[PDB]
Amino acid sequence: SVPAGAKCRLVETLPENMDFRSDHLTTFECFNEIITLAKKYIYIASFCCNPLSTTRGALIFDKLKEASEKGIKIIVLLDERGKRNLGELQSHCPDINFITVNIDKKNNVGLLLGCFWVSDDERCYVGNASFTGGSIHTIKTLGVYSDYPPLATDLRRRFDTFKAFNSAKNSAANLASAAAALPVSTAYHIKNPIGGVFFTDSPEHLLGYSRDLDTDVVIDKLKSAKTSIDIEHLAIVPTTRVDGNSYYWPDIYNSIIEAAINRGVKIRLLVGNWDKNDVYSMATARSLDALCVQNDLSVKVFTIQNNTKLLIVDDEYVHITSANFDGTHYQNHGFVSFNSIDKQLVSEAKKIFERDWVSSHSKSLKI
Amino acid sequence: SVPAGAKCRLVETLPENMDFRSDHLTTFECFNEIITLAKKYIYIASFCCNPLSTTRGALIFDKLKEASEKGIKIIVLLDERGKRNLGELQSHCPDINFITVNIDKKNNVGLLLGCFWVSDDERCYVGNASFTGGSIHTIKTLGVYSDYPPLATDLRRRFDTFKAFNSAKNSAANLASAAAALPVSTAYHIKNPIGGVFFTDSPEHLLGYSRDLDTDVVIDKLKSAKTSIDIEHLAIVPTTRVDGNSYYWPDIYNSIIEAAINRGVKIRLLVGNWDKNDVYSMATARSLDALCVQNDLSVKVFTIQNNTKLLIVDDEYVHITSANFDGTHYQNHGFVSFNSIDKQLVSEAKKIFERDWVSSHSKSLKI
Numbered sequence A, B: 001s002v003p004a005g006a007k008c009r010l011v012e013t014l015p016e017n018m019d020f021r022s023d024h025l026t027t028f029e030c031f032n033e034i035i036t037l038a039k040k041y042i043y044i045a046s047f048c049c050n051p052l053s054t055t056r057g058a059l060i061f062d063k064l065k066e067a068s069e070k071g072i073k074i075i076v077l078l079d080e081r082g083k084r085n086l087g088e089l090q091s092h093c094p095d096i097n098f099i100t101v102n103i104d105k106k107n108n109v110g111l112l113l114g115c116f117w118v119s120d121d122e123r124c125y126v127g128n129a130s131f132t133g134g135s136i137h138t139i140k141t142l143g144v145y146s147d148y149p150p151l152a153t154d155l156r157r158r159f160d161t162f163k164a165f166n167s168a169k170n171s172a173a174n175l176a177s178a179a180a181a182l183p184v185s186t187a188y189h190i191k192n193p194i195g196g197v198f199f200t201d202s203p204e205h206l207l208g209y210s211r212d213l214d215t216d217v218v219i220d221k222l223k224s225a226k227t228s229i230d231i232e233h234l235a236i237v238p239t240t241r242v243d244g245n246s247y248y249w250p251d252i253y254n255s256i257i258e259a260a261i262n263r264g265v266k267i268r269l270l271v272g273n274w275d276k277n278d279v280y281s282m283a284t285a286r287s288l289d290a291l292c293v294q295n296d297l298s299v300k301v302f303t304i305q306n307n308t309k310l311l312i313v314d315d316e317y318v319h320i321t322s323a324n325f326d327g328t329h330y331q332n333h334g335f336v337s338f339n340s341i342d343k344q345l346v347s348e349a350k351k352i353f354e355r356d357w358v359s360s361h362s363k364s365l366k367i
C-alpha cells in the first residue's frame, strides 16, 4: 500500500529577524538530511547559485563539498545568467560538476527555475528555496521534503529533462534532432497522482506528450474553486516587462476575478509591495481596491524578502512552486511545481498561510 | 456584377441641440423613404416601441399608420418588457400587428434588440435607432440604409427567426420541438460576404449551424488589429449587473488591452459617463487611466443620450450594432449587427468617428 501524502512534510526558511515560528522542518536541516543520507548522488537545480552569502549557506556548501570528496556524484544545474559566481563555486568544490543551462536559446527568454534537490532516488526537496545563502538563512522560503523513492524518482526525471540543455557542445539546447531524442517521461500527473501528490511542469515546449502544464493545472484549480482561494505569491500583476517591452498576460488574474465576482469565492491575496513609479502595479492595485470593497476579497502586502509561492484552494488543494503567477514565468520559464490534495498536508499549508496572513509583516492594503 | 458596399449608406440621428453636422441621411428621412417606397410589407424590430414621445417619431408613426391603412402588412416586434406602451400603440394603429417577443423564457434574461427595418425584400435599415421618438428626434443614433434586395432579404431572414418567439400560443418560445423546426437561415456571413457586407447575429443559442456569432467576429477583428481601434459605445466595463448580481465578462475588455499593450495599437474609446457610486465603473476608469499614460490609448466621455455602437478597425473594418460591448448583451440578448469592409463605407465611418471624437460633447477623461 502507498502512504497518505506520499511521506511529504512541509519545509520552510524563517529568519531570526522575522516573527515566523513553526514546528516544521527548516530548509537548513532539510539540506543537511539530504546530504547526510546521500549514498549515490545529489542533484540540485535552481536559477542562481551563491551559497556563501550567509553562514548556513556556507555550512551547507561545506557539507556538499565533503559529500563530493567522499565519492558522491554532485551535479548542480544553474541558468547561464547566474554564471557570475561560477568561478567562485568551482574554486571551492573542484569535485562538484556545475552545469550552465539555457532551456531557451531560440529567443533567450526561458530561465531555469528548478529549485529542487533529489538524492539516491529516495529523498527529495522541492520549493522556492534556491541553492543560495539567502534562501537558506535570511530569506523566508517554503517547500516540501519527502523520503518517498517513487516521488524522488519522478523528480529526478525532471532533473534529467533539464540537464540536457547544457550550453557546451551539441545537446538539447543546440540541436533539434538531439532535443527530439529526449525521453521526457513522468510517472505521476493530475490524472494519476501518487498518495495525493503530483508534479506539474513548465514550459509548454518542454512537456512532451505526457507531462502536464502547470499553467493549465493552476487555471483549472482556480476556476473550479467553490469556497476559498488563498494565494501568497510575489505579485499578481497581469503585465510583466520582458527586456524593454511590456507583456500582457491576464489568465490567472482573470480566473481569480471570475472566482471572486461570479462565484463569490472568499479570496485572500498576500503579495509583495510594489513600486509607486510602476503604473501597471498601481493600476492593478487600484483595480483590486474597488473589488475588495464590493466582493469578499482581501489583500495584504509584505516588504520582506520572501520567495514563497503558495496556492490553497478550498482547503482541499495545495500548490507550491518556485515561479510567480505571471505571464513571463508560466509562458517561458522552466520549473517544476508540487501539487497535493492530502487533507493533512493541505491543512498544514492552510495553517502556514493563516500564520502569514495575520503576521506583523502583512500590513493591510492601502491606496 | 454586385455593387461595391452593397448600396449601403450611412444614416444617423443628430439632434438640433447638438453640434453634430453631416451630409449623410437622417433616420427620419430613412424611415420616410422606407415607408413611402413600401409595396408589400414593413417589418420593424426593436426593444421598446414608443414613437409618440417626440414630433418626428409621431410623424413616422402616422406615415406607418397610413401605410397599414392602404393594405401594407405591418408587423412590429418588441420585447415583452416594452409592453407598457402596447395598449397605447394598438389604440392608434388597429391595422398594425404588434407582437411581444421573449427570446429567452428559460431564464428570462435574453432581450430582443433587433433595431432594424426591412421592406419588400428590397429596402432595409439596421442600426441603433429603435422605433421610438427619441431615437428619431432627440437621441443621437447611427446605422446604415440599403436598397439592395439580397441584403434586405438576408435581414428579413433574421426578422423571421426573431418573430417565432411570440409569447401567445405554442411557438419557438414555448415548445422545444417547434423551436427546433425553425429554418434559421443566412445568405451571407464572414466567410461569404456580399459587396463587402455581412450580418452577424446574437445570441449563440439562436444561430443554428450557419449564422456567425457577433461575439466571435468582434473578438477576432479586435485581436487581428494592427494599426488602430476606434470604439464609440456606451461603456466597456467588463462587469454588468444582471438582476441583483454582478456578472464578470472581460472578453472584449481583455482583447482590447491585448491590442493596446502587446501590439501597441492606437486605441481611442469614446464612452458614456459613469456613476461615481458604481465601484466597477470607477475601477475600470482608474485601470484605463494608468494605461492611457503608458501606452498609446485615449479615452473621452460623453453625457448626451447617444445609442451609437460603432467599431472601426485599421480603417478597413467597420461594425455597427444596437447592443453594447459587455457581458449581458453578447451572452443573452438577441440582435443583428452590420459589418463591412468596403473602403469607402469604412472611410465615411472613420469620418463620423473623427467628428465625434473632437466634438464638444467629448470631454477628455479625468479622474
Ligand SMILES: Cc1cc(C(=O)NNC(=O)c2ccncc2)ccc1Cl
Residues within 6 Å of the ligand: A237, A238, A239, A248, A257, A279, A280, A281, A283, A284, A287, A288, B237, B238, B239, B248, B257, B280, B281, B283, B284, B287
Ligand atoms: C493591464 C492591466 C489591466 C488591468 C485590468 O484588467 N483591470 N480591470 C479590473 O480590475 C476590473 C474592472 C471591472 N470589473 C472587473 C475587473 C489591471 C491592471 C493592469 Cl496593469
